[PDB]
Amino acid sequence: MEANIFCTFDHKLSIADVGKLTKLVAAVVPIPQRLHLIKHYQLGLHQFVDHTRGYVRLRGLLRNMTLTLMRRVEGNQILLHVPTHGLLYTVLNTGPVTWEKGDALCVLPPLFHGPLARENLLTLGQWELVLPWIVPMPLALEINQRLLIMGLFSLDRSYEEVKAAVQQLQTITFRDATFTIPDPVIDQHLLIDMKTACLSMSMVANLASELTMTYVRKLALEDSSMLLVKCQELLMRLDARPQHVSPDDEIARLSALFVMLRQLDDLIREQVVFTVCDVSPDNKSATCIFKG
Amino acid sequence: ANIFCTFDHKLSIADVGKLTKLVAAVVPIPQRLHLIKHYQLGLHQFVDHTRGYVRLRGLLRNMTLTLMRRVEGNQILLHVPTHGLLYTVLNTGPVTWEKGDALCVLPPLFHRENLLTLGQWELVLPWIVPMPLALEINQRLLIMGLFSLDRSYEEVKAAVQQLQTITFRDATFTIPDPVIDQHLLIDMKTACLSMSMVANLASELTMTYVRKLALEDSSMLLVKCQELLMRLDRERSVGHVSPDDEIARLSALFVMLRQLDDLIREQVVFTVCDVSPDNKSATCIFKG
Amino acid sequence: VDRWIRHAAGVERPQLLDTETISMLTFGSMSERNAAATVHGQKAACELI
Amino acid sequence: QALTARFFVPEGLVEFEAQPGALLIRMETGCDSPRHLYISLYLLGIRASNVSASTRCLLESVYTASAARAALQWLDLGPHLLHRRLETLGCVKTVSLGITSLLTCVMRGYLVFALMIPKDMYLTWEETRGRLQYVYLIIVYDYDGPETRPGIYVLTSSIAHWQTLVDVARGKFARERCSFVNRRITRPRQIPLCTGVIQKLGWCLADDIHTSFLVHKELKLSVVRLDNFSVELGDFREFV
């Protein structure tokens, strides 16, 4: 296997740039082709980033690519190391997001942040180095879910009604931080995802058993608690012995319901890339296991 | 690589003699550390009289798994596995194993041999189960949670009595009820009501969103889906929205399905290729 | 008329390009397959304006 | 390096599988004495709807042993579900023939170690040859007919991230998905699980793919071959 990747800079390496790059050692950068030797253009997302077109497209392009770690550099030579599944590695936090002990990580395209004054790395000519965001599971799942919600809600509505909802949706608060999705324009990829979501939602609506349909009504009649009060408050606009009980048919129907819900979940959950051990107290670096 | 654990309690001849027979079992720990107190070892710290089984399952999801093989004077030597190598595990599970099985971990449901008890604390190990049995047992326990509110009628009683037992490759079990003292635990309650809520919300939301999406390039999938919904509406019905309430509805549907991810995905952790009349023991490749 | 033109010249039926992600993964399609035999050298690409 | 494994299988199943490079599957059975039985990918071809008539005739001709026929009866007995009953072991290369045969399997390794696929079962979504390719085993369920006979394919693709592969599979298999919905509506008392199942086993260089013929008992089969192969098993993941 190509356990090492060499990249060569065509431009001259001034002392400031090489020192700055030396500070980035052991960070995470993606590489498209996995080929043994690669030019400096493909290192980073700058070749593919385009604010005019979908953030969904950039999300897909990022999730398709491969992940690598950084190594110390020398004259005109920068060394990249591909991780092997199951081993233990050291990574540095590229974004400002806080990291916590014992939760998974995901990779996502960069996000707008409070000051908007993002630091520029290795701006060699018209080319620039930009890193992907390594994000813990709740924030990444929340942002992907809310992007899908944007796509599903905004369709077939005028800009006026959409204007308040997008300002409510776009802002994400996560563990005392604030974030905003750069460019949530609808794209054909989002339409395919939405078509699959609609099919799965209708299927689970259909094949759900009677007990599952009537469960919350019976319990709301029976009990009363804050969770049930909230559920009824949600369903208020919409709002006996079962004549048939069949354990085997119920088992099969619930298995079908699980395959449907399993499919619907895959639309949201991005693939894990890292699982963490305990983190340095400065929130800048962590030691993690890599998964493929 | 190794992980150490030291008991603060005394150990007699019998205690260590009972412990040493677990020279190949699986023991989970909260997080990786060099030297941990024995109270952190095992699942006992999490069990209490109200918080149920699905919480144990979901918490064991993110818990790490370790292997043990040594007994020094008072320190227990743990052995973390690495994805790709092979290791020997001890069959703490109540089922027989077969070559080529896919293995999954479950919280202990019906735990006498494991009882290393000291200072009102007891060591308690998770179950090792083949994958189909694990998926089926979660399905069965969940539907048993569904029946929890209608448990007075005789038909429901007979159905849940039938549902209690599982049979699998010459072994037969009784899976204990999630209900205790005629009431249902909060954890199973929230899991069941979340699944019911996502089903219900999907039922109403599907019509509006299939109509809205079909305004774009309609396809055969959409029309047959809409026909299925029409059939459902026809058989059920025998006898506009506010935008903020709409967005709340979608958020509620996804947040309800989102917590269900803890139990639905039966992640595999072991695959085995060896067997002996020693069936207590087996050699496996680590996964997950 | 499209089919008739495809028959008139010795050209194959049209073929869709690869998508964005696959185009980024794979380095080229080489649609014109290698010829069976060639005594003379590399086929000189003659373009017409 | 390689993780060797060892199985026993009766002679009736072996004769066409006896060529060193083959792929093996484990099947559960409700019958108590044969609790498990071992089936190679070729034997799935006798029932796979994708396999052409001539190759199906050859497969019917070869696997005439009573034990193999009982295995196929157990396979066909399964109501509209096979992945609940099939489990993947991996690639094999060693065999000793006899009244009960012995063969070894590798579940993780890259130590000739060519993996063989029948020509009927092989497809690619892309004609451009990507330098790095993954290969997957997929099962697809047809639903437009009276009762569900399954489809079998082994495919190579340059896509690694799962959801992108599911997207392209949905794009190419839209007919099967519509057929699944049609099955759900037309027979409401029956509840199918999935349209298809993806399973991952592959790491190989694309320049080392070969086309070849194979012979047994002077009967001739056409096959496609992966030469410089490495095996990495995975979970049976269901898609719609």
Side-chain angles (χ1 to χ4, degrees):
Chain A
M1 189 179 289
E2 302 89 334
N4 287 99
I5 295 91
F6 285 83
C7 179
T8 58
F9 288 118
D10 292 349
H11 191 272
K12 318 311 299 185
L13 265 292
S14 303
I15 193 66
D17 285 339
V18 76
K20 187 177 297 182
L21 177 59
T22 304
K23 293 193 194 300
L24 277 296
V25 296
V28 54
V29 292
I31 285 293
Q33 194 48 234
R34 178 61 85 83
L35 192 59
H36 191 261
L37 172 63
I38 201 166
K39 307 295 190 178
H40 67 85
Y41 289 109
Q42 287 83 351
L43 179 73
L45 303 185
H46 184 63
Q47 179 152 357
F48 310 96
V49 67
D50 186 357
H51 303 82
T52 303
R53 199 172 292 98
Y55 173 88
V56 181
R57 171 185 160 273
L58 182 59
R59 177 192 77 171
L61 186 138
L62 188 147
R63 69 172 62 182
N64 198 282
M65 283 199 295
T66 80
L67 278 295
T68 71
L69 272 297
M70 190 63 71
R71 211 46 50 89
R72 82 292 183 276
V73 303
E74 59 189 1
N76 290 77
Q77 295 285 332
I78 179 168
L79 172 60
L80 271 65
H81 177 220
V82 57
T84 48
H85 192 164
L87 277 296
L88 171 56
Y89 299 89
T90 297
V91 300
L92 282 72
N93 190 10
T94 64
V97 183
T98 311
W99 296 23
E100 292 82 4
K101 179 172 180 165
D103 59 4
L105 302 182
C106 290
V107 63
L108 288 182
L111 315 177
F112 292 166
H113 193 267
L116 278 298
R118 294 294 88 190
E119 179 65 28
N120 55 292
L121 292 77
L122 316 186
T123 56
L124 277 296
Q126 71 273 29
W127 183 90
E128 173 168 23
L129 174 66
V130 67
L131 313 178
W133 277 35
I134 298 302
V135 176
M137 178 64 74
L139 172 56
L141 194 75
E142 188 69 35
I143 207 166
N144 191 52
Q145 188 278 340
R146 204 155 298 218
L147 184 57
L148 187 77
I149 289 306
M150 194 80 71
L152 188 47
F153 174 85
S154 69
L155 178 65
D156 201 62
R157 287 276 180 71
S158 166
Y159 271 110
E160 267 293 338
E161 290 81 0
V162 168
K163 176 161 161 274
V166 297
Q167 282 303 326
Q168 181 179 352
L169 287 163
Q170 278 191 9
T171 68
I172 298 302
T173 52
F174 168 85
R175 299 191 182 154
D176 297 330
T178 302
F179 306 101
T180 289
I181 296 93
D183 287 302
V185 64
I186 292 175
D187 182 79
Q188 176 69 17
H189 198 186
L190 195 69
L191 287 199
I192 297 161
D193 274 348
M194 205 156 71
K195 279 181 186 176
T196 290
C198 193
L199 172 63
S200 305
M201 192 147 43
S202 75
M203 283 305 298
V204 60
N206 173 269
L207 67 87
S209 73
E210 181 67 19
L211 309 182
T212 59
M213 282 288 106
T214 196
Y215 174 75
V216 298
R217 301 275 180 65
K218 282 177 170 278
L219 198 151
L221 185 71
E222 182 82 355
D223 283 351
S224 282
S225 299
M226 184 67 210
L227 172 59
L228 277 296
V229 166
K230 263 294 170 192
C231 280
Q232 285 306 99
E233 192 173 89
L234 184 79
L235 262 57
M236 179 265 284
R237 317 303 180 127
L238 312 176
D239 280 11
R241 178 171 54 134
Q243 293 290 358
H244 269 162
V245 290
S246 298
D248 290 7
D249 195 61
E250 193 74 11
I251 282 288
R253 279 190 196 243
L254 205 80
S255 188
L257 193 143
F258 291 168
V259 65
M260 288 301 157
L261 289 186
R262 180 174 296 143
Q263 185 57 80
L264 180 53
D265 172 49
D266 285 331
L267 297 183
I268 313 304
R269 173 167 278 94
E270 201 70 55
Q271 184 158 0
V272 289
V273 292
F274 286 90
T275 296
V276 299
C277 292
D278 63 358
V279 181
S280 301
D282 68 350
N283 193 71
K284 298 296 180 183
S285 68
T287 66
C288 308
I289 313 301
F290 175 80
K291 299 192 180 185
Chain B
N2 274 315
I3 285 176
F4 290 82
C5 177
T6 65
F7 304 93
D8 276 3
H9 201 276
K10 316 305 184 289
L11 282 72
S12 68
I13 301 299
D15 306 307
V16 65
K18 180 153 40 176
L19 185 49
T20 182
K21 293 185 189 297
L22 304 186
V23 65
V26 298
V27 291
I29 55 180
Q31 273 305 336
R32 300 187 180 198
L33 180 54
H34 187 62
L35 188 153
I36 50 179
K37 291 284 189 177
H38 71 284
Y39 298 118
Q40 271 74 349
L41 184 61
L43 283 173
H44 191 91
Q45 63 211 302
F46 300 101
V47 66
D48 67 37
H49 294 88
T50 186
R51 291 289 182 262
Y53 172 81
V54 185
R55 199 189 71 155
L56 274 163
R57 159 61 169 251
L59 188 141
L60 188 67
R61 165 70 67 67
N62 70 45
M63 189 172 279
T64 187
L65 299 179
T66 61
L67 301 187
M68 158 173 58
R69 84 300 186 282
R70 201 183 281 176
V71 184
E72 303 203 353
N74 63 73
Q75 314 203 57
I76 279 288
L77 195 75
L78 301 187
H79 210 66
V80 290
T82 47
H83 189 176
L85 277 73
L86 73 89
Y87 301 93
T88 63
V89 298
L90 190 146
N91 179 18
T92 63
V95 190
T96 188
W97 302 5
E98 189 53 275
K99 184 147 47 187
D101 275 322
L103 263 50
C104 187
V105 289
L106 278 76
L109 283 155
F110 204 76
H111 65 279
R112 298 286 91 79
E113 303 180 338
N114 302 337
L115 301 183
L116 191 151
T117 58
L118 53 86
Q120 49 72 5
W121 167 83
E122 64 202 51
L123 177 68
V124 57
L125 270 59
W127 274 14
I128 303 283
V129 176
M131 165 67 171
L133 197 154
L135 184 57
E136 201 192 318
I137 192 173
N138 296 115
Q139 290 161 2
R140 170 184 279 101
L141 190 57
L142 287 179
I143 62 170
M144 190 168 296
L146 271 293
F147 277 114
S148 64
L149 193 49
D150 295 314
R151 295 279 288 244
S152 70
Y153 307 106
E154 183 70 9
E155 289 175 305
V156 169
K157 271 296 309 181
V160 68
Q161 181 78 1
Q162 175 175 359
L163 274 164
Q164 268 189 342
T165 181
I166 188 64
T167 175
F168 184 95
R169 303 206 287 237
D170 81 13
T172 57
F173 295 158
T174 50
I175 305 316
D177 298 332
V179 292
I180 65 175
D181 305 347
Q182 201 173 16
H183 269 287
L184 185 72
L185 297 181
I186 179 172
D187 186 74
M188 196 74 171
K189 186 174 294 186
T190 187
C192 177
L193 62 83
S194 60
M195 183 278 288
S196 177
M197 193 57 50
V198 62
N200 290 318
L201 287 166
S203 293
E204 286 95 10
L205 199 71
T206 284
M207 179 54 170
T208 69
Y209 286 164
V210 66
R211 182 209 295 173
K212 203 161 69 170
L213 188 153
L215 308 187
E216 300 304 79
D217 54 337
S218 69
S219 184
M220 185 64 76
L221 185 152
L222 276 171
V223 65
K224 292 205 191 197
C225 182
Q226 198 264 9
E227 173 162 2
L228 178 66
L229 190 45
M230 285 299 100
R231 198 171 185 285
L232 184 141
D233 189 6
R234 286 276 161 272
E235 81 174 350
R236 291 304 184 172
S237 297
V238 295
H240 87 292
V241 292
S242 306
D244 43 359
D245 202 65
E246 175 88 342
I247 200 75
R249 286 186 199 181
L250 294 91
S251 74
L253 190 155
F254 275 90
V255 75
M256 287 294 169
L257 62 83
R258 173 167 147 195
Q259 74 165 33
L260 215 54
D261 292 332
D262 282 10
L263 61 87
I264 64 162
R265 291 187 180 275
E266 205 80 31
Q267 80 285 338
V268 59
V269 301
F270 278 100
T271 181
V272 54
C273 47
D274 208 3
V275 65
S276 306
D278 211 47
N279 300 86
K280 219 71 180 176
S281 311
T283 79
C284 304
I285 304 165
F286 185 76
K287 274 279 195 175
Chain C
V1 65
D2 191 281
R3 216 84 60 76
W4 194 86
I5 289 303
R6 305 291 175 167
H7 161 274
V11 308
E12 204 73 358
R13 287 278 281 167
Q15 166 196 352
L16 287 164
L17 279 171
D18 304 331
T19 54
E20 182 71 26
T21 52
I22 309 308
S23 80
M24 175 266 288
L25 269 293
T26 68
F27 64 92
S29 66
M30 55 172 284
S31 57
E32 284 195 69
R33 193 147 299 292
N34 297 321
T38 178
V39 172
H40 302 319
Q42 194 166 47
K43 170 196 184 172
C46 192
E47 299 269 30
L48 297 187
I49 72 184
Chain D
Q1 267 290 356
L3 276 298
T4 177
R6 180 171 283 100
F7 313 132
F8 296 124
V9 62
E11 199 277 338
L13 280 298
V14 182
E15 64 178 283
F16 206 94
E17 184 191 316
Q19 280 281 359
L23 187 139
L24 186 61
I25 308 297
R26 183 181 56 66
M27 191 173 77
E28 193 163 65
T29 303
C31 190
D32 283 305
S33 66
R35 188 69 67 204
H36 294 268
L37 197 45
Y38 301 80
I39 294 179
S40 45
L41 178 63
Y42 307 102
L43 188 53
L44 283 176
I46 191 167
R47 284 290 181 194
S49 64
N50 168 66
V51 184
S52 312
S54 56
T55 303
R56 292 194 72 239
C57 177
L58 187 143
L59 268 293
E60 278 275 26
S61 74
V62 178
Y63 287 87
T64 51
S66 180
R69 190 67 73 184
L72 277 296
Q73 176 56 32
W74 302 134
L75 185 147
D76 192 46
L77 177 61
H80 68 80
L81 287 176
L82 294 183
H83 57 263
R84 293 288 182 263
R85 197 181 294 94
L86 293 178
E87 186 53 86
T88 56
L89 293 163
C91 183
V92 302
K93 64 91 176 179
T94 284
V95 63
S96 294
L97 298 97
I99 66 178
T100 300
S101 76
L102 160 65
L103 75 168
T104 187
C105 181
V106 291
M107 302 182 171
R108 181 173 297 217
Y110 57 97
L111 274 162
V112 187
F113 190 31
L115 186 148
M116 198 65 74
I117 296 156
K119 180 60 189 69
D120 291 87
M121 293 184 163
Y122 182 88
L123 70 88
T124 74
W125 304 134
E126 55 198 16
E127 187 65 28
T128 297
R129 277 282 157 254
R131 186 186 165 281
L132 164 63
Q133 287 182 168
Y134 298 78
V135 55
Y136 308 86
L137 167 65
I138 77 169
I139 190 166
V140 177
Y141 288 67
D142 197 348
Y143 283 114
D144 58 22
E147 59 88 20
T148 292
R149 278 181 65 190
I152 295 294
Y153 303 106
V154 179
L155 80 166
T156 50
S157 77
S158 312
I159 307 173
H161 185 290
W162 193 73
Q163 285 136 24
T164 316
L165 187 55
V166 186
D167 274 336
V168 73
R170 285 164 175 143
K172 290 286 155 66
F173 279 110
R175 190 276 316 290
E176 295 295 327
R177 184 149 71 158
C178 290
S179 307
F180 158 83
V181 172
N182 194 1
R183 176 62 50 162
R184 182 61 192 129
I185 179 159
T186 192
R187 306 206 77 240
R189 302 172 193 284
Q190 184 169 5
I191 47 173
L193 273 298
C194 73
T195 69
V197 182
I198 312 298
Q199 195 273 331
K200 311 187 291 186
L201 61 84
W203 183 258
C204 75
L205 277 296
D207 306 336
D208 305 340
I209 185 165
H210 305 340
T211 313
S212 196
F213 53 87
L214 181 145
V215 64
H216 175 63
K217 288 279 184 63
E218 301 310 301
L219 306 176
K220 183 65 52 63
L221 181 63
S222 56
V223 291
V224 70
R225 197 183 209 172
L226 300 179
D227 191 44
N228 189 15
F229 186 74
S230 183
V231 65
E232 294 194 6
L233 277 294
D235 187 16
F236 262 63
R237 202 165 171 148
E238 299 173 353
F239 79 89
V240 65

